[PDB]
Design a protein around this ligand. Sequence first.
Ligand SMILES: O=C(NN1C(=O)[C@@H]2[C@@H]3C=C[C@@H]([C@H]4C[C@@H]34)[C@@H]2C1=O)c1ccc(C(F)(F)F)cc1
Lengths: 367, 367
Amino acid sequence: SVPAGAKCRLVETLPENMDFRSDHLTTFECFNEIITLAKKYIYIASFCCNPLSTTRGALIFDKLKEASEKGIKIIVLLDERGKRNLGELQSHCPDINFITVNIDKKNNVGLLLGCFWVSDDERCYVGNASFTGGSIHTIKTLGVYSDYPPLATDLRRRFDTFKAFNSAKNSAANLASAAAALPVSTAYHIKNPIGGVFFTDSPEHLLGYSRDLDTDVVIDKLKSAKTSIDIEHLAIVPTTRVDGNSYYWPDIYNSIIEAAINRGVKIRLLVGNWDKNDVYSMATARSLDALCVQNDLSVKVFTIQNNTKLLIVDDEYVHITSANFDGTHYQNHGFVSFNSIDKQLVSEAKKIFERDWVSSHSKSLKI
Amino acid sequence: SVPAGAKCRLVETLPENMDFRSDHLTTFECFNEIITLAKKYIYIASFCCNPLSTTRGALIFDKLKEASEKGIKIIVLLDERGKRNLGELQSHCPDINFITVNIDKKNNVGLLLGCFWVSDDERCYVGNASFTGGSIHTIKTLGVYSDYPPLATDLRRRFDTFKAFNSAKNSAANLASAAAALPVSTAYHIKNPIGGVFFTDSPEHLLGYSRDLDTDVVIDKLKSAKTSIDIEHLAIVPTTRVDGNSYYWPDIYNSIIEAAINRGVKIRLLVGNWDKNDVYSMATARSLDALCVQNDLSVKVFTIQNNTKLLIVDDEYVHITSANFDGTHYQNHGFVSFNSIDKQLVSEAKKIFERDWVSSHSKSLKI
Ligand SMILES: O=C(NN1C(=O)[C@@H]2[C@@H]3C=C[C@@H]([C@H]4C[C@@H]34)[C@@H]2C1=O)c1ccc(C(F)(F)F)cc1
C-alpha cells in the first residue's frame, strides 16, 4: 500500500542571522543524508554550482568529493551560464562529472533551474536550494525530501531529460534527431499522483506527450481556489525584462486578482522588494496596494536573500518550486515543481507560511 | 458588382457648444432621411427612448409620428429599464409600436443597446446615437449610414432577434421553447463581408450558430495590430461594478497592453474622466500613466458628454459600436457592432480620430 504523502517531509535553510525557526530537516542535513546513504549514484541539477562560498556548502562538497572517490557516480547538471566556477569545481573534484546544459539553443532564453538531488532511485530533494554555499547556509530556501523510491525514480526521469541537453557533441541540444530519440516519460502526474504527490514540468517544448505543464497546473489551481491563496515568491510583476526588452505576461497575475475580486478569495502575497526606479514594479506595487483597500488582499515584502517559491491553495494543495511566478520562467525555463494534495503535508507548509507572514523580515506593503 | 464600402458613410452628432467640425451627415440629417424615404417600415432599437429632451430630438419625433400616420409600420425597441418615458411616448405617438425588451431574464444583467435604425430593408443607421434628444442634438456621437439593401437587410435580422425578447406573453423572453424557434441568422460576417463591411454581435447566448461574437472579433483585431491602435471609448478599466459588486475582466485591457509592450504598437486611448474616489479607476489611470513613460502609449481624457465608441487598427480596420470596451458589456449586453476593412471608410474614421485627439475637449492624462 502506498504511504500517504509518499514519505515527503519539508526541508529548510533557516540562516542564523534571520529569525525563522522550525523542526524541519535542514538543507544541510538533507544533503548530508543523501550523500551518506548513496550506493550507486547522486544526480544534482541546479542553475549555478558554487558550493565553496560558505562553510556548510564546502562541507557538503567534501562529502560529495569523498563519495565520488568510493565509486559513486556523481553527475552535476548546471546551466551553461553558471559555468564560471567550473574550473574551480573540477580541480576540487576531478571524479565528479560536471555537465553544462543549454535547453534553449533555438533562442538562448530558457535556463536550467531544475533544482533537485536524486540518488539510487530511492532518495531525492526538490525545492529552491541550488547547489551553492548560499542556498545551503545563508539564504532562506524551502524544499521537500523523500525516500520513497517510486517518487525518487520519477524525479530521476527529469534528470534524464535535462542531461540530454549537454552543450557538447550534437545529440539532443545540438541535433533535433536524437532530441526526439529521448522518451520524455513520467510515471505520475495530476491525473495519477503517488500518495497524493506529483511533479509538474517546464518548458512546453521539453514536455513530451505525457508530462504536465506547470503553467497549466498552477493557473488551474489558482482559478479553482474557493477560500485562500497564500504565495511566497520573489515577484508577481506581470512584466519581466529579457535581452533589454520588456515582456508582458499577466496570466498568473490575473488569476490572483480574479480570485480576489470575482470570487472573494483571501490572498496573502509575500514577495521581494523592488527597485523604486523600475517603473513596472512601482506600478505593479501601486496596483496591488489599491486592491488591498477594497478586497481581502494583503501584501508584505522581504529584503532578505530568500529563494522560497511556495503556493498554497485552500489548505488542500501545496506547490513548491524553483521557478518564480512570471512569464520569463513559465514560458522558457527548465525546472520541476513539487505538487502535493496530502492534507498533512499541506498543513506543515501552511504552518511555514503563517510563520513567514508574521516574521520581522516581512513588512506590510507601503506605497 | 458589390460597391466597395457597401454605400457606407460616417454620421456624427457635433454639438454647437463643442469644437468638433466635419462635413459628415449629421445624426439629425440622417434620421430625417430615413423617415422621409420610408415606404414600408422603420425599426429603431436603443437602450432608452427620450426624443423630447431637445429641439432636434422632438423634430425627429414629429416626423416619425407623421410617418406612422401615413401607414408606415414604426416599431421602437427599448430596454425594460428605459421604460419610464413610455407613457409620455405613447401619448405623443399612439400609432407607433413601443416594445420593451429584457434579453436576460435569467440573470437580469444584460441590457439592450442595439442602437440602430433600419427601414424598408434598404436603409440603416448603426452607431452610438440612441433615440434620445441628447444623442441627436447635445451629445457627441458617431455612427454609420448605408442605403445598400443587402447590408440594411442584414441589420434588420438583428432587429428580428431582439424583438423576440418582448417582456410580454411567453414567447422568446419568457419561454425557452419559442426562443429556440427563432433562426438567429446573418448573411455577412468576418469570413464573408459585403463590400468590406460586416456586423458583429453580442451577447454569446443570443449568438446562434452563424453570427460572430464581437468579443472575439475585437480581441483578435487588437492582437493582430502591427502598427497602430486608436481607441475612443468611455473607459478601458478592467473592472466594472454590477449589483454593487465589482467584476474583474481584463481581456481587452490586456490585449492593448500586450500590443504596446510586446509588439511595439503605437496606441492612443481617448477615454472619459473618472471619479477620483473610485479606487479602481484611479489605479487604472496610474497604470496607464506608467505605461506612457516607457512605451508609445498615449492617453487623453474628455469630460464632454460623448457616446463615441471607435476602434481603428493599423489604418486597415475600423470598428464602431454602442458598447463600451468592458466586461459588463462584452459578456452580457445586446448590441450590434459595425466592422469595415474598406480602406476609404477607414481613412475617414482615422481623420475623425485625429481631430478628436487634438480637440480642446481632449486633455492629456495627468496623474
Ligand atoms: O493590473 C492592473 N494594473 N496594472 C497593469 O495592468 C500592469 C501593467 C501596467 C502597469 C503595471 C505593469 C506594466 C504592467 C501593472 C499594473 O499595475 C490593475 C488591476 C486591477 C485593477 C482594478 F483596480 F480595477 F481592479 C486596476 C489595475
